[PDB]
Amino acid sequence: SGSMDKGTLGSGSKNNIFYILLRDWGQNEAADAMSRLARLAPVYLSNRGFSIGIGDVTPGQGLLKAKYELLNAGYKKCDEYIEALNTGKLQQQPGCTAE
Amino acid sequence: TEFFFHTMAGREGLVDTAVKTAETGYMQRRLVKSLEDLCSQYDLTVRSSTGDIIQFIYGGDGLDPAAMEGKDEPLEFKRVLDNIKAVFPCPSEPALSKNELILTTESIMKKSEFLCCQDSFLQEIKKFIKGVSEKIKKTRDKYGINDNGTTEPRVLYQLDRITPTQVEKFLETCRDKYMRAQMEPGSAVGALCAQSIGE
Amino acid sequence: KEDLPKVVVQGIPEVSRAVIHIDEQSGKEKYKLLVEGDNLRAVMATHGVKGTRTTSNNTYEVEKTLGIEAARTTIINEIQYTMVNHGMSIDRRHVMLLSDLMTYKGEVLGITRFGLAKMKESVLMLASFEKTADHLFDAAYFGQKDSVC
Amino acid sequence: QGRFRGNLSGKRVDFSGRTVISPDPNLRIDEVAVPVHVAKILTFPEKVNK
Amino acid sequence: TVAVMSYSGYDIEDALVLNKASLDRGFGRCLVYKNAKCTLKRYTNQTFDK
Amino acid sequence: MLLFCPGCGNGLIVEEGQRCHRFACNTCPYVHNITRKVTNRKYPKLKEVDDVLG
Amino acid sequence: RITTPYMTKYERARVLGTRALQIAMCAPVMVELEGETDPLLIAMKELKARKIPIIIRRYLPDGSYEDWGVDELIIT
Amino acid sequence: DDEEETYRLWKIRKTIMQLCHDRGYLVTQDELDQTLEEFKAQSGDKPSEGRPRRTDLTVLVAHNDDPTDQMFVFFPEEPKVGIKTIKVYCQRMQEENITRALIVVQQGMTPSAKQSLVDMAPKYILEQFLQQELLINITEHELVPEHVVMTKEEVTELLARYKLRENQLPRIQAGDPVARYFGIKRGQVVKIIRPSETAGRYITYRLVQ
Ligand SMILES: [Zn+2]
Fold this sequence. Notes:
Largest sheet of chain G: 2 strands, antiparallel
Helix content of chain F: under 10%
Shape of chain F: elongated
Subcellular location (chain G): Nucleus; Nucleus, Nucleolus
CATH class of chain G: Alpha Beta
Organism (chain G): Homo sapiens (Human)
CATH topology of chain G: Eukaryotic RPB6 RNA polymerase subunit
Helix content of chain G: 25-40%
Oligomer: part of a larger assembly
Distance between the termini of chain G: 19 Å
Distance between the termini of chain F: 44 Å
Protein name (chain G): DNA-directed RNA polymerases I, II, and III subunit RPABC2
Bound molecules: zinc ion
Keywords (chain G): Acetylation, DNA-directed RNA polymerase, Nucleus, Phosphoprotein, Transcription
GO molecular function (chain G): DNA binding; DNA-directed RNA polymerase activity
CATH superfamily of chain G: RNA polymerase subunit, RPB6/omega
Number of helices of chain G: 2
Order of helices and strands of chain F: EEE
């Protein structure tokens, strides 16, 4: 069960399958497994096809609407904070000044 | 304006890396020049070039950091036990209860080959054995499993199934891993420490 | 008038600023003191401060106040904390060996040329690292025979 | 560039080469591909035995 | 005509795969011109390099 | 405060004469006896009750 | 008899190097090599067959020593 | 005052009792476990309490080694102790035939008095202690591990097991706070028990030099 990723096949930390092979069955078995992976994965990746295009990074309509609403809300809150600090008393956070 | 700010941030990162390269190069040079003299002797005592002892035992225990399977621990007993159960599943042997597991563990641990092992690792093994025995006891109390081995649903024995063969395999594997994870005499521990700190 | 307001009436002269840090643990929120000073003995000696659990960042103060082993423990803890702050992990045995090498002559000796000269004895290494001519002339004056160990 | 740092601790050696690297997944992790041109220059002294 | 895709695993880190037929038809063909200069100067004495 | 002699403009110091404390200049016989109280407050900044952070 | 019974990687490297240097200098072979023109391969074959006639002399820091045979030590 | 001063005096007395118990001298459990109320019963005010005389201790004897051996604790009232006070203390120890004495200064010791105390006499051993350091017990600190001075037999067994010499052991200065706390001399060895992250402990050894 599960799908391979950097957490299991990468060089991040322990629990790697190659690390388990190295610690359980020696160095030769881990080296052979890594060679088989390096010889198998490119073949399948080429036979299947993996490409990135401009359409893979374009934003959607709902994303644009959400971004617009969030920008409006954030700008309104920032303007409210600016007005509170410049004209009046602004709640000063502990350990720092008003600015 | 946003492009200018992004270029400012990129140039800040670039100059930070440029300073970091030379600074860490000098630090690594100093650390290696200072630590290159230490070496692990055959009597498990780290001594300098003049013969003075820096440590009576490396790291307090004497284990190789390169062979450290766990988080600053020699072995992960849960993973080792699971691997022993998976590699050697004995279907012709009955399961072990808490008392039987404790008895066989105490019988195996008192052998001659386990005497040369450190006491802390043996205590950790005993703690893990007691924990897994308590888990098996809790499971058998929840599901009413009888230690006599005559319960009608045999699948209940598959919840926490342990056999003395697997216990012996687990103990021997742990002992071998602990023996092979110790500091090999003659290793330049000081240079390894300097590099692993400078990098 | 230039220095009358600048006289100390209460507190440790070495202490410049102390703040009240709070821990918001779900069981209880406890209060501790974060002091940006260079006097550990005075802080421990003050009333109401649990000196048994007082640490510091300056290794020299810890060495001078609580011994060489406390200095070694402080070095280990500080190096490990600084390393963890950046998300990278180092095995504790390396920092333990470093602290033991820095604290094996009874005094915390640095990795600089002075500490390296106080620790090492080999003339060739001292000359090769830094201050070549000075170390070589001093060895020629002392007539110190250097082994190849 | 002194004697200790430039000629004693770190010095230049022969029987060595320097080349740009390129990927090749069809080789084992403990193997490295050497060009024929460099292989003809870097020589190894083998003693004649039985 | 670049196609952004993974092919044969020979383009792992920043590498690129070139077409043999493209290079055969003049793509990427380059010329390197070097200069070799020599001087035949007359010395103080009435003799010259020949 | 800082006071200056109207005669030459040099700084005035405070000394004690034969009858009372007086302001005097070191470069001219100008003096000025003190009649009533003279004060010069500065009102130093009071350290605020720092907040408990964390 | 007090040191580790396992043969370290440094001892392995040095023993293999010495055996390869000897075999390269017309030393007798004890494993009956089968078409191995590389002396290091012959040394590794002798190590795996435990026929290397070399005894390691482990020195203690104080000055004491102890002799361990290659066949007596444990290999991995 | 009259509240923090008596608290400091009580805590210094408790720390001195703990130090004497750690060094092996004879102290009853009541002296070790002394509450502030008992100290107030002895003296509850600063003018009533006598630093130079009412706090001096002479019952300190090494019951484990020899009851005849006697140790004394001094509490000079003046902040800076001069030559005259040191001479008075030395002649008092000569009268009472005491070779080991402790001096708990209030603020410090003048350089001349320090130099004199260094070379008073090889038989008259006197150790300078600041009251600021004695307000907290170094042994009870979490960073300071457990230190135990080993006898000559244990040092011989260590050197025989490790085939070592005295100079090859790790060094520790005599001016170390723990060294002055235990009053260890040149040549003695201290075993240190560092608490590891696990349930085990790390045993190391240091030579005073
Ligand atoms: Zn004037």
